[PDB]
């Protein structure tokens, strides 16, 4: 028994269904065999101790889920997933990780196996902090996040949550994996959009930290304030509404 929640109920059927649905919503990925995807996903963690998972265990899945996204249309995020996804629902040429096949399959799910049987553990799974870091879920997200960040080019945008105690958190997935795998030259600029929950939050100490990290990788940094995120989304969808324009 572990400290974290058990595998999501009907995990096999959920992955299969998500794969089929993805290939329906995204016709460009209809060449994938969803049964093969599931077999590869399961192969990464079944009959294995869930504190000894490696990026290599997920390689077969990564190969099968290969997806070349337009490298200049990537939206990263940290602690504000819902808004980033709402944005790509209205700005449909842009992609977050969870708009790719592999990210879509796993988003909000939990899974693990055990060393001595081919059973999925529905009772409990390792918590990153309390139990162990190299667990099936954490290793999956580390692997796919690294690869997605590696593939980005030109200007990369990131939404950050302006209401958090740390707007930029070096211990977040964004701060510990994604930001350190943006490639210089390939990526010219990282532009942060700080989402308000009316000061200029681009002067926040943690934003100055992010700027330093990025500049040390020889990438330019830009920061913007999104003062009204829901209104922002409305105006992305329909910019011709008069509430999209400042009063004279």
């Amino acid at each position, epitope marked *: 028994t572990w400290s974290g929640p058990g595998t999501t109920k009907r995990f096999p059927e959920t992955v299969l269904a998500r794969c089929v649905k993805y290939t329906e919503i995204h016709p460009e990925m209809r060449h994938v065999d969803c049964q093969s995807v599931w077999d590869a996903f399961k192969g990464a963690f079944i009959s294995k101790h869930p504190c000894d998972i490696t990026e290599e265990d997920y390689q077969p899945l990564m190969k099968l889920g290969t997806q070349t996204v337009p490298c200049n249309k990537i939206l990263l995020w940290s602690r504000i997933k819902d808004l980033a996804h709402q944005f790509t629902q209205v700005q449909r040429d842009m992609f977050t990780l969870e708009d790719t096949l592999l990210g879509y399959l796993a988003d909000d799910l939990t899974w693990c196996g055990e060393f001595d049987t081919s059973k999925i553990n529905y009772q409990s799974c390792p918590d990153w902090r309390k139990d162990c870091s190299n667990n099936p879920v954490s290793v999956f997200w580390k692997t796919v996040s690294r690869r997605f960040a590696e593939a980005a080019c030109d200007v990369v945008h990131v939404m950050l949550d302006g209401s958090r105690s740390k707007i930029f958190d070096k211990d977040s997935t964004f701060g510990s994996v994604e930001v350190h795998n943006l490639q210089p030259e390939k990526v010219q600029t990282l532009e942060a959009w700080v989402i308000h929950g009316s000061r200029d939050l681009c002067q926040d100490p943690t934003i100055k930290e992010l700027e330093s990290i990025i500049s040390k990788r020889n990438i330019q940094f830009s*920061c913007k304030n999104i003062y009204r995120p829901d209104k922002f989304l409305q*105006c992305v969808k329909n910019p011709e509404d008069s509430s*999209c324009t400042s009063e004279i």
Partner: nanobody
Amino acid sequence: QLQESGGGSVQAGGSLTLSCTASGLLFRLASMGWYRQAPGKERELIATITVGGKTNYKDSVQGRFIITRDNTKSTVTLQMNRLKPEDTAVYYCNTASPAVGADTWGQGTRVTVS
């Protein structure tokens, strides 16, 4: 990110056309505007334009100025006709959106009407 041009000196009654190139995704998604600042005065918004080209003007320039837009870069242009000494100012282009900041500013372009 913001580069303005087309200013100069003209006689009262004359015309100038200002241009601004704005580089960035947020400019492409936002309503844009032309602002101006007279030497000892507050910066004022004088003209706005939606992504699709719907315009609005301050009463003091209505009928004399025309704002246009071409669309990640947006170019925003301000045609200024029948110029008055009161139009003397530094002109700036930026976002004019309640959703997104007019965070940073270009150098502006100086207009002097004698």
